[PDB]
Amino acid sequence: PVPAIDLSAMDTSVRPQDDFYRYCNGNWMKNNPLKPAYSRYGSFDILHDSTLERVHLIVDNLAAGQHEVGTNEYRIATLYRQAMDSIKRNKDGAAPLKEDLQKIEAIADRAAMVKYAAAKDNMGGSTFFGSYVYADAKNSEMNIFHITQTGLALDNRDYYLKQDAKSQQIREAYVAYLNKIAKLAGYDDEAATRIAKNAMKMETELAQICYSKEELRDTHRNYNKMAVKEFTNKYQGFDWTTYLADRQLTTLEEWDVEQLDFFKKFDSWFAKADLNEMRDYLLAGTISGAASYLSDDFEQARFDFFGKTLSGTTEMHPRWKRSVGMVSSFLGEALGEVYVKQYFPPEAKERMLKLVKNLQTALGERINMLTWMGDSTKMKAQEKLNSFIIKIGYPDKWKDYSKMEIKGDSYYADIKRASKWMHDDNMADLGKTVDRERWLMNPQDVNAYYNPTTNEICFPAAILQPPFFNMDADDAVNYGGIGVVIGHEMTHGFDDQGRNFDKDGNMINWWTAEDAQKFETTARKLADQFSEIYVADGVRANGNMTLGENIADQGGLLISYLAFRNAAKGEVMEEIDGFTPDQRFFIGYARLWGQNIRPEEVLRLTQIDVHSLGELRVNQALRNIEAFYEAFNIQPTDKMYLEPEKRVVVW
Ligand SMILES: CC(C)C[C@H](NP(=O)(O)O[C@@H]1O[C@@H](C)[C@H](O)[C@@H](O)[C@H]1O)C(=O)N[C@@H](Cc1c[nH]c2ccccc12)C(=O)O
Ligand SMILES: [Zn+2]
């Protein structure tokens, strides 16, 4: 019988009323200092790592055997062995990159830049901006074409623009990274520094006209469907008509310009930008995008910046972990099929479905018991909740990889073939009915998700294991673990983004203005509540960026606690390990989040992660949960206590 709670993780010298996070995790945290390759390590990573070890065996077994060309076993074995083949990768050096760089150097003028972007984007690139095919937000049954602002290497545009000393140091390390890899690619000292500085200048200019991370979360702002000619007739600084023609999209009548104001400013930036500076931007981007796929010196330069500088790590993960991760990103469902055959019991799928339906019923009750919302919006909320698509364990049909060509000539060349396959597979959806059954994660992912355009909640097999889902545990702990996860994904249907989408996945208003304003006032109170909290000295939590996840955590806690009480109706509350079932619910929840984390990684996740830090998902989120105050008799002098007027309950 797998224990329901690791009691040894707990630090019972801490009062649960003062620091519940360390009460439930503080001895695990003392006994598990971070290893050099980890920027953060906690319960999710434990389960991730043990799942990865299972996948490691699957992949190593395939790599040891013989397979026919054109099977998935051949594709997996060949990608993985090439990634693992440090002798060949180090022998080849930068040679696999040579022709790609020559193609960029040959771009003769601005017109040729446009055609180059179309050619690389036809391979899956994002030369100056992103583009993708997926459901129309306002017609979720039809696939349309979307364009999005420049993907930035540092992710948050603020890294490029903030004027303080620590931000300048990060920028200088990024430029040193580009200089290092340009030298490794064969440029002399002068050209490598020129390329690094020009690339950073171009990327900083693009970051300036990008939307902020918080602004990218605004649903209505980032949808702008229109006739193509309406935009391309007016904004001709970038020759969209030639670009679209070379992407074979001349007959495309409409598109979704997601960051419309970025593309209006991009019109002038592209028309006026120095050609040599743009070429250097393209060179640095191509080298950086190849740096995980060549010789050790490239991969270590990349680690020096993205690992050591940005995250505080001092070692790379072992090569097999990077290699399994790469294979899983291109052939993940082929691996997922083997994984579930070997490790996923059917009893888990059926027990999980009963659990999800119990949570759905509890959420129906929470919505019925709201009093801040009028009856008419409440009825639309129930309609949405009753139409969740539930996906558990694995997809009912597996992805067909048969057109993916893997040759084994070089790691980088096959990476490009795998990416081309994924790109062609995406473009093939254009103008076709949306496949609503598709999984956006693999069975072996230790995670779960909500998707607004299908109104689906999805629970991969790998997350249905202890400490989330433990078929031997008492109910209280399973509700505190996977039950809160389920309710968290459900609440995403009703957070500041998902509330905009209806039961069919369409971005259609189902709110009265008055109820929406009330939601927005209450949500802003939860945002400001978290932004009062310090994640490090002088650094506030970003309550705005994490607002959707904090709403979902709170919803998961309230829904799952209600479902747990429902399930306990007609039973007497037996203590276990000296804890009431109510206390075991909260301890089981807090045990999901115990982690150690490097100071650098605290700063990085505050800039890029919409999820709060694990410590705040326990110590801050629970301060709004009245049932938690009761379970541990929290008084006004306890450090966990929040004054009632400052508490906020959204749903
Ligand atoms: C309630 C929770 C158990 C499930 C929940 N999944 P959820 O956010 O809905 O699913 C997806 O997660 C990421 C892939 C995306 O960035 C999100 O926008 C969302 O779509 C979550 O917190 N996922 C975390 C889990 C996680 C990943 N790495 C971790 C390291 C430590 C602790 C937790 C984690 C995450 O994706 O961040
Ligand atoms: Zn979430």
XYZ file of C-alpha atoms and ligand atoms in Angstrom:
689
model
C 0.000 0.000 0.000
C 1.606 3.243 -1.227
C 1.363 5.750 1.665
C -1.207 8.484 1.196
C 0.962 11.196 2.777
C 4.755 11.081 3.163
C 4.729 12.016 6.849
C 8.497 12.418 6.793
C 8.101 15.343 4.380
C 6.308 17.282 7.091
C 8.025 19.608 9.554
C 5.840 19.412 12.667
C 8.060 21.990 14.473
C 6.333 24.607 12.290
C 2.863 25.676 13.319
C 0.422 24.936 10.444
C -1.316 28.207 11.384
C 1.872 30.201 10.655
C 3.464 28.491 7.638
C 1.350 25.662 6.239
C 3.699 25.179 3.264
C 6.663 24.326 5.490
C 4.497 22.420 7.955
C 3.636 20.040 5.085
C 6.924 20.148 3.118
C 9.701 21.649 5.247
C 11.509 18.407 6.115
C 11.301 17.190 2.536
C 12.819 20.536 1.583
C 15.680 20.210 4.116
C 16.433 16.628 3.041
C 16.385 17.299 -0.735
C 18.772 20.152 -1.538
C 18.860 20.974 -5.245
C 21.216 18.980 -7.443
C 23.474 21.067 -9.758
C 21.334 20.450 -12.861
C 18.027 21.519 -11.275
C 16.760 25.056 -10.959
C 13.717 23.778 -9.008
C 12.694 20.379 -7.694
C 9.508 19.266 -5.990
C 6.685 16.743 -6.098
C 5.861 17.316 -9.784
C 9.525 16.818 -10.744
C 9.753 13.605 -8.694
C 6.897 12.134 -10.707
C 8.178 13.655 -13.944
C 11.576 12.037 -13.365
C 10.152 8.617 -12.580
C 7.942 8.839 -15.681
C 10.962 9.892 -17.726
C 12.873 6.842 -16.489
C 10.050 4.636 -17.790
C 10.252 6.364 -21.155
C 14.066 6.019 -21.011
C 13.699 2.219 -20.932
C 11.231 2.279 -23.837
C 13.497 4.405 -25.991
C 16.698 2.547 -25.066
C 15.000 -0.752 -25.954
C 14.019 0.629 -29.386
C 17.509 2.045 -29.988
C 19.077 -1.377 -29.332
C 17.034 -3.307 -31.923
C 16.720 -3.360 -35.703
C 13.799 -1.670 -37.446
C 12.579 -1.105 -40.998
C 12.821 2.374 -42.520
C 9.559 4.246 -42.157
C 8.324 2.720 -38.914
C 7.799 4.792 -35.791
C 10.287 2.518 -33.981
C 12.853 3.433 -36.641
C 12.049 7.149 -36.362
C 12.366 7.127 -32.578
C 15.552 5.027 -32.505
C 17.247 7.117 -35.184
C 16.459 10.502 -33.640
C 17.464 9.316 -30.199
C 20.727 7.627 -31.214
C 21.772 10.710 -33.186
C 21.086 12.986 -30.219
C 23.072 10.583 -28.000
C 25.979 10.294 -30.500
C 28.354 12.856 -29.063
C 31.258 11.487 -31.174
C 29.510 12.267 -34.479
C 27.991 15.544 -33.248
C 31.424 16.748 -32.077
C 33.138 15.515 -35.247
C 30.632 17.352 -37.476
C 30.831 20.589 -35.470
C 29.095 23.464 -37.290
C 29.161 21.728 -40.704
C 25.402 20.814 -40.710
C 24.671 24.575 -40.411
C 26.798 25.727 -43.319
C 24.236 25.808 -46.130
C 21.579 27.482 -43.963
C 24.024 30.294 -43.140
C 25.080 30.702 -46.781
C 21.424 31.088 -47.771
C 21.091 33.997 -45.322
C 24.351 35.627 -46.426
C 23.120 35.455 -50.046
C 19.985 37.546 -49.357
C 20.703 40.470 -51.661
C 17.967 43.025 -50.865
C 14.726 43.705 -48.981
C 12.601 41.943 -51.599
C 14.740 38.856 -51.159
C 14.264 39.087 -47.366
C 10.506 38.675 -47.837
C 10.927 35.621 -50.027
C 13.468 34.169 -47.583
C 10.965 34.530 -44.750
C 8.335 32.727 -46.818
C 10.770 29.928 -47.663
C 11.892 29.341 -44.076
C 8.342 29.693 -42.755
C 7.311 27.027 -45.283
C 9.718 24.773 -43.318
C 8.153 25.631 -39.946
C 10.235 28.678 -39.138
C 9.086 31.959 -37.598
C 11.486 34.246 -39.444
C 10.098 37.628 -38.335
C 6.731 36.599 -36.844
C 4.652 33.558 -36.011
C 1.914 31.943 -38.028
C -0.233 28.893 -37.369
C -3.455 27.113 -38.320
C -6.084 26.360 -35.666
C -9.718 26.972 -34.716
C -11.324 30.354 -35.352
C -12.065 31.719 -31.861
C -15.543 32.755 -33.122
C -16.200 29.567 -35.158
C -14.545 26.696 -33.302
C -15.414 24.149 -35.975
C -13.345 25.838 -38.687
C -9.549 25.991 -38.957
C -8.200 29.389 -40.001
C -4.771 31.002 -40.447
C -3.344 33.229 -37.681
C -0.314 35.508 -37.446
C 1.341 36.533 -34.178
C 4.068 38.889 -32.992
C 7.790 37.986 -33.023
C 8.803 35.210 -30.650
C 11.502 36.692 -28.399
C 14.456 34.600 -27.217
C 14.086 36.026 -23.691
C 10.264 35.575 -23.834
C 9.113 38.657 -21.834
C 9.774 41.888 -23.789
C 10.744 43.545 -20.488
C 14.154 41.776 -20.533
C 15.040 43.903 -23.580
C 13.723 47.197 -22.195
C 14.067 47.519 -18.377
C 16.817 49.977 -17.468
C 18.111 48.658 -14.140
C 21.537 47.118 -13.471
C 20.363 43.504 -13.173
C 18.436 43.719 -16.458
C 21.483 45.124 -18.219
C 23.607 42.245 -16.915
C 21.175 39.690 -18.338
C 21.226 41.475 -21.717
C 25.027 41.486 -21.708
C 25.113 37.739 -21.035
C 22.646 37.209 -23.897
C 24.864 39.180 -26.299
C 27.887 37.196 -25.082
C 25.943 34.010 -25.878
C 25.201 35.162 -29.448
C 28.870 36.174 -29.868
C 30.060 32.756 -28.607
C 27.861 30.757 -30.958
C 28.582 33.017 -33.943
C 32.255 32.311 -33.352
C 31.544 28.571 -33.044
C 29.676 28.732 -36.357
C 32.841 29.981 -38.120
C 32.667 33.793 -38.010
C 35.872 35.595 -37.054
C 36.122 37.671 -33.867
C 34.984 40.882 -35.539
C 32.038 39.373 -37.426
C 30.840 37.392 -34.396
C 30.656 40.564 -32.259
C 29.020 42.473 -35.107
C 26.367 39.744 -35.511
C 25.682 39.517 -31.789
C 25.226 43.280 -31.362
C 23.143 43.731 -34.532
C 20.920 40.757 -33.662
C 20.273 42.126 -30.191
C 19.553 45.580 -31.621
C 17.009 44.151 -34.072
C 15.415 41.906 -31.461
C 15.181 44.797 -28.973
C 13.387 46.889 -31.585
C 10.941 44.047 -32.208
C 10.426 43.600 -28.453
C 9.572 47.308 -28.169
C 6.604 46.893 -30.561
C 5.513 43.518 -29.097
C 2.637 43.317 -26.665
C 3.517 42.753 -23.018
C 3.019 39.277 -21.513
C -0.018 40.502 -19.585
C -1.536 42.160 -22.653
C -1.176 38.885 -24.597
C -3.645 37.310 -22.109
C -6.506 39.741 -23.043
C -8.813 37.531 -25.100
C -10.679 40.095 -27.210
C -7.630 42.299 -27.829
C -5.701 39.383 -29.399
C -8.369 38.362 -31.928
C -8.752 40.403 -35.119
C -10.251 38.413 -37.976
C -10.449 40.336 -41.252
C -10.086 40.043 -44.992
C -6.409 39.591 -45.897
C -6.585 42.303 -48.596
C -7.950 44.786 -46.058
C -4.658 44.614 -44.165
C -2.235 43.906 -47.005
C -3.578 46.711 -49.261
C -2.821 49.283 -46.586
C 0.381 47.930 -44.950
C 2.911 47.326 -47.721
C 6.182 48.044 -45.914
C 6.465 44.263 -45.621
C 5.420 42.744 -48.956
C 2.647 40.523 -47.592
C 1.293 39.684 -51.054
C 4.612 38.179 -52.161
C 5.067 36.437 -48.783
C 1.612 34.849 -48.913
C 2.040 33.856 -52.558
C 5.287 32.057 -51.758
C 3.550 30.290 -48.847
C 0.965 29.029 -51.394
C -1.727 31.170 -49.694
C -2.837 33.439 -52.578
C -6.408 32.108 -52.347
C -6.646 32.831 -48.595
C -9.417 35.394 -48.142
C -9.374 35.942 -44.356
C -6.967 35.628 -41.432
C -6.663 36.335 -37.716
C -4.101 39.064 -37.010
C -3.689 38.323 -33.313
C -1.398 41.208 -32.307
C -2.781 43.766 -34.753
C -0.851 46.762 -33.381
C 2.384 44.803 -33.568
C 1.798 44.179 -37.265
C 0.968 47.839 -37.934
C 4.232 48.906 -36.294
C 6.084 46.020 -37.989
C 5.069 47.540 -41.347
C 7.251 50.586 -40.677
C 10.045 48.705 -38.864
C 10.570 46.298 -41.755
C 10.409 48.948 -44.487
C 13.102 51.040 -42.776
C 15.423 48.494 -41.110
C 19.048 48.317 -42.237
C 19.492 45.263 -44.455
C 22.830 44.171 -42.944
C 21.418 44.440 -39.423
C 18.391 42.325 -40.394
C 20.654 39.733 -42.019
C 22.671 39.480 -38.794
C 19.431 39.038 -36.828
C 18.568 36.101 -39.105
C 22.051 34.599 -38.719
C 21.974 34.736 -34.925
C 18.466 33.249 -34.853
C 19.467 30.377 -37.121
C 22.594 29.608 -35.104
C 20.745 29.855 -31.771
C 17.940 27.613 -33.068
C 20.548 25.057 -34.113
C 22.658 25.205 -30.917
C 20.918 22.250 -29.214
C 21.570 20.019 -32.246
C 25.280 20.351 -33.084
C 28.571 19.899 -31.182
C 28.966 20.167 -27.380
C 30.418 23.670 -27.522
C 27.135 25.065 -28.958
C 24.976 23.279 -26.422
C 27.167 24.399 -23.556
C 27.125 28.039 -24.693
C 23.327 27.813 -24.704
C 23.348 26.264 -21.217
C 25.718 28.990 -19.908
C 23.047 31.553 -20.670
C 19.624 29.887 -20.380
C 20.695 27.565 -17.547
C 23.452 29.130 -15.459
C 22.724 32.840 -16.010
C 18.900 32.792 -16.183
C 18.157 29.839 -13.828
C 21.155 29.453 -11.539
C 21.964 25.853 -12.510
C 25.587 24.777 -12.759
C 25.262 21.537 -14.784
C 23.283 20.338 -17.739
C 20.881 17.448 -17.276
C 22.292 14.125 -18.560
C 22.225 13.781 -22.337
C 19.634 10.986 -22.237
C 17.079 13.302 -20.602
C 17.565 15.986 -23.251
C 17.376 13.288 -25.955
C 14.237 11.630 -24.617
C 12.687 15.111 -24.336
C 13.490 15.833 -27.982
C 12.006 12.536 -29.177
C 8.908 13.099 -27.090
C 8.322 16.484 -28.700
C 8.229 15.009 -32.243
C 6.941 11.478 -31.738
C 5.230 11.853 -28.378
C 2.106 9.843 -29.167
C 4.089 6.886 -30.496
C 5.896 6.813 -27.171
C 2.636 7.467 -25.354
C 1.009 4.404 -26.888
C 3.779 2.133 -25.560
C 3.739 3.890 -22.196
C 0.041 3.329 -21.539
C 0.097 -0.296 -22.750
C 2.816 -0.997 -20.188
C 1.905 1.214 -17.219
C -1.682 2.494 -17.297
C -4.251 0.186 -15.619
C -7.855 0.378 -16.907
C -9.229 0.623 -13.341
C -7.495 4.000 -13.138
C -9.400 5.344 -16.147
C -12.795 4.331 -14.746
C -12.106 5.496 -11.181
C -10.895 8.815 -12.669
C -14.058 9.284 -14.731
C -16.226 8.822 -11.615
C -14.014 11.340 -9.829
C -14.272 13.918 -12.629
C -18.055 13.561 -12.697
C -18.170 14.091 -8.913
C -16.151 17.303 -9.316
C -18.421 18.469 -12.163
C -21.462 18.003 -9.900
C -19.786 19.915 -7.078
C -18.929 22.783 -9.431
C -22.599 22.839 -10.492
C -23.492 23.344 -6.832
C -20.913 26.116 -6.300
C -22.316 27.957 -9.286
C -25.883 27.425 -7.984
C -24.826 28.876 -4.589
C -23.274 32.056 -6.025
C -25.096 35.183 -4.993
C -23.013 37.875 -6.673
C -24.176 36.770 -10.155
C -27.685 37.238 -11.566
C -29.798 34.217 -12.506
C -29.521 34.724 -16.256
C -25.701 34.541 -16.361
C -25.834 31.728 -13.789
C -27.940 29.730 -16.236
C -25.375 30.273 -19.027
C -22.586 29.235 -16.622
C -24.387 25.948 -15.873
C -24.883 25.347 -19.596
C -21.133 25.642 -20.156
C -20.210 23.494 -17.145
C -22.590 20.738 -18.220
C -20.912 20.478 -21.624
C -17.252 19.814 -20.642
C -15.546 17.262 -22.906
C -13.640 14.920 -20.567
C -10.414 13.262 -21.815
C -8.649 10.754 -19.549
C -5.497 8.667 -19.898
C -4.856 8.633 -23.641
C -6.523 9.552 -26.948
C -8.914 7.073 -28.524
C -7.049 7.336 -31.878
C -3.256 7.657 -32.245
C -1.425 10.173 -34.435
C -0.295 9.024 -37.884
C 3.423 9.839 -38.369
C 3.853 7.973 -41.665
C 4.875 10.960 -43.774
C 7.751 11.963 -41.465
C 11.100 11.303 -43.140
C 13.960 10.457 -40.786
C 17.162 9.565 -42.645
C 19.978 9.467 -40.085
C 22.429 11.656 -42.033
C 22.766 14.197 -39.183
C 20.893 15.044 -35.970
C 20.214 18.612 -37.122
C 19.065 17.571 -40.598
C 16.551 15.114 -39.121
C 15.367 17.716 -36.574
C 14.539 19.922 -39.563
C 12.711 17.068 -41.325
C 10.690 16.331 -38.192
C 9.831 20.033 -37.880
C 8.859 20.208 -41.554
C 6.513 17.267 -41.053
C 4.851 18.970 -38.081
C 4.511 22.199 -40.067
C 2.998 20.487 -43.122
C 0.634 18.576 -40.830
C -0.529 21.887 -39.373
C -0.990 23.638 -42.730
C -3.016 20.654 -43.955
C -5.727 21.557 -41.409
C -6.432 24.918 -43.119
C -10.062 25.340 -44.150
C -10.950 21.893 -42.745
C -13.248 20.982 -39.859
C -11.504 21.241 -36.484
C -10.496 17.890 -35.001
C -11.928 18.285 -31.484
C -10.675 14.876 -30.254
C -6.985 15.785 -30.664
C -4.846 15.771 -27.512
C -2.637 18.791 -26.798
C -0.522 16.750 -24.357
C 0.809 13.188 -24.439
C -0.191 10.346 -22.098
C 3.236 10.455 -20.429
C 3.077 14.190 -19.539
C 2.836 14.888 -15.776
C 0.370 17.762 -16.266
C -3.289 18.448 -17.188
C -5.072 21.125 -19.178
C -8.204 23.002 -20.164
C -8.773 24.125 -23.740
C -11.329 26.946 -24.272
C -11.963 26.363 -28.007
C -13.231 22.837 -27.301
C -14.308 23.315 -23.677
C -12.307 20.180 -22.848
C -10.483 19.044 -19.716
C -7.680 16.532 -20.184
C -5.862 14.297 -17.669
C -2.906 12.335 -19.119
C -2.186 8.897 -17.655
C 1.097 10.049 -16.108
C -0.556 12.483 -13.693
C -2.859 9.738 -12.403
C -0.252 8.453 -9.927
C 0.704 9.278 -6.332
C 0.781 11.781 -4.778
C -2.026 13.055 -7.080
C -4.092 9.884 -7.518
C -3.406 6.964 -5.194
C -5.844 4.078 -5.415
C -4.829 3.049 -1.864
C -5.190 6.457 -0.247
C -8.106 7.733 1.820
C -10.570 9.869 -0.161
C -9.570 13.102 1.567
C -6.053 12.898 0.146
C -7.085 11.970 -3.395
C -9.530 14.927 -3.336
C -6.779 17.186 -2.009
C -4.487 16.003 -4.849
C -5.950 14.989 -8.219
C -9.361 16.344 -7.164
C -7.985 19.877 -6.836
C -6.188 19.391 -10.182
C -9.484 18.415 -11.825
C -11.324 21.377 -10.329
C -8.449 23.653 -11.329
C -8.775 22.671 -14.984
C -12.584 23.026 -14.760
C -12.256 26.539 -13.305
C -10.171 27.579 -16.302
C -13.441 27.466 -18.187
C -14.495 30.346 -15.934
C -11.335 32.412 -15.364
C -10.516 35.810 -16.870
C -9.857 34.239 -20.300
C -12.082 31.161 -20.382
C -15.259 32.983 -19.296
C -15.215 34.547 -22.788
C -15.837 31.164 -24.480
C -19.195 29.387 -24.538
C -20.197 25.728 -24.304
C -19.143 25.119 -27.943
C -15.727 26.782 -27.661
C -16.820 29.999 -29.406
C -15.771 33.415 -28.161
C -19.377 34.607 -27.693
C -20.486 36.790 -24.783
C -22.780 34.955 -22.355
C -22.446 37.562 -19.569
C -24.557 40.558 -18.730
C -22.428 43.710 -18.491
C -23.265 44.002 -14.797
C -22.156 40.455 -13.959
C -18.971 40.861 -16.025
C -18.120 44.073 -14.172
C -18.649 42.298 -10.860
C -16.405 39.418 -11.944
C -13.744 41.899 -13.061
C -13.816 43.826 -9.772
C -13.493 40.634 -7.771
C -10.737 39.279 -10.043
C -8.797 42.545 -9.694
C -8.994 42.168 -5.915
C -7.405 38.696 -6.201
C -4.730 40.134 -8.524
C -3.891 42.959 -6.109
C -3.977 40.514 -3.200
C -1.177 38.402 -4.682
C 0.803 41.464 -5.823
C 1.125 42.471 -2.138
C 3.234 39.316 -1.590
C 7.025 39.346 -1.966
C 8.552 36.371 -3.775
C 12.056 37.676 -2.963
C 13.519 40.834 -1.393
C 12.259 43.759 -3.422
C 10.343 41.531 -5.871
C 6.552 41.316 -5.789
C 4.518 38.421 -7.086
C 2.877 39.421 -10.375
C -0.763 39.026 -9.351
C -1.913 40.235 -12.781
C -0.021 37.695 -14.893
C -0.869 34.837 -12.525
C -4.520 35.844 -12.060
C -5.967 33.067 -14.227
C -4.000 30.360 -12.423
C -4.797 31.790 -8.980
C -8.519 31.806 -9.848
C -8.200 28.189 -11.010
C -6.306 27.099 -7.861
C -8.925 28.666 -5.628
C -11.713 27.104 -7.678
C -10.038 23.721 -7.563
C -9.755 23.938 -3.783
C -13.405 24.952 -3.283
C -14.888 22.514 -5.830
C -12.828 19.578 -4.639
C -13.433 20.285 -0.957
C -17.190 20.286 -1.667
C -16.952 17.047 -3.661
C -14.957 15.539 -0.789
C -17.619 16.504 1.769
C -20.293 15.139 -0.596
C -18.462 11.813 -0.792
C -18.127 11.696 3.010
C -21.878 12.088 3.577
C -23.048 9.155 5.667
C -19.661 8.350 7.211
C -17.992 9.107 10.532
C -14.751 11.073 10.174
C -11.983 8.659 11.226
C -8.675 10.357 12.064
C -5.608 8.942 10.277
C -2.047 9.720 11.464
C -3.670 12.022 14.023
C -5.312 14.176 11.305
C -9.005 14.742 10.611
C -10.090 14.033 7.014
C -10.499 17.786 6.521
C -6.873 18.335 7.560
C -5.721 15.490 5.285
C -7.410 17.183 2.322
C -5.352 20.309 2.882
C -2.121 18.446 3.700
C -2.527 16.359 0.538
C -2.955 19.569 -1.460
C 0.083 21.243 0.099
C 2.232 18.153 -0.523
C 1.782 18.652 -4.283
C 3.669 21.935 -4.107
C 6.699 21.429 -1.851
C 9.832 22.336 -3.801
C 13.274 23.828 -3.571
C 13.986 26.577 -6.093
C 17.038 28.669 -6.927
C 16.880 32.461 -6.403
C 17.555 33.013 -10.138
C 14.650 30.724 -10.990
C 12.316 32.592 -8.613
C 13.105 35.714 -10.679
C 12.750 33.989 -14.045
C 9.404 32.339 -13.265
C 8.056 35.648 -11.928
C 8.815 37.092 -15.387
C 7.595 34.231 -17.596
C 5.289 31.838 -15.663
C 1.521 32.411 -15.395
C 1.524 29.962 -12.435
C 2.388 31.272 -8.985
C 5.351 29.754 -7.135
C 4.490 26.575 -5.246
C 5.016 28.321 -1.916
C 2.346 30.911 -2.805
C -0.062 28.327 -4.273
C -0.175 26.991 -0.677
C 0.554 29.869 1.703
C -1.344 32.584 -0.205
C -4.124 30.639 -2.005
C -5.326 29.013 1.233
C -5.847 32.386 2.970
C -9.115 32.713 0.989
C -10.391 29.217 1.872
C -12.743 29.410 4.865
C -12.702 25.629 5.279
C -8.926 25.828 5.800
C -9.291 28.313 8.663
C -11.699 25.857 10.290
C -9.601 22.748 9.693
C -6.580 24.228 11.528
C -8.370 26.714 13.862
C -6.594 29.742 12.417
C -6.781 32.827 14.657
C -6.111 36.526 14.011
C -2.633 36.225 15.589
C -1.534 33.368 13.290
C 0.691 34.308 10.379
C -1.539 32.513 7.813
C -4.541 34.603 8.886
C -5.861 37.202 6.446
C -8.407 39.727 7.637
C -11.902 38.733 6.415
C -12.426 41.963 4.465
C -9.206 41.297 2.511
C -10.161 37.718 1.567
C -11.584 37.218 -1.929
C -13.595 34.288 -3.297
C -14.219 34.474 -7.042
C -16.456 31.421 -7.640
C -3.406 22.423 -11.107
C -2.206 21.802 -11.745
C -1.733 20.595 -10.994
C -2.395 21.574 -13.214
C -2.106 22.879 -13.985
N -2.154 22.709 -15.398
P -2.581 23.923 -16.389
O -1.955 25.207 -16.039
O -4.035 24.094 -16.409
O -2.132 23.445 -18.000
C -1.257 24.221 -18.722
O -0.039 24.415 -17.979
C 1.024 24.951 -18.775
C 1.441 23.846 -19.745
C 0.555 26.254 -19.480
O 1.548 27.271 -19.390
C -0.798 26.726 -18.893
O -1.234 27.953 -19.469
C -1.875 25.619 -19.013
O -2.518 25.626 -20.286
C -0.719 23.364 -13.461
O -0.528 24.078 -12.445
N 0.343 22.948 -14.202
C 1.690 23.316 -13.782
C 2.482 22.065 -13.336
C 3.957 22.135 -13.294
C 4.872 22.032 -14.344
N 6.207 22.127 -13.889
C 6.170 22.298 -12.507
C 7.206 22.452 -11.570
C 6.829 22.614 -10.247
C 5.483 22.623 -9.857
C 4.458 22.482 -10.784
C 4.769 22.312 -12.111
C 2.457 23.964 -14.980
O 2.183 23.539 -16.138
O 3.277 24.875 -14.683
Zn -3.914 26.271 -14.829
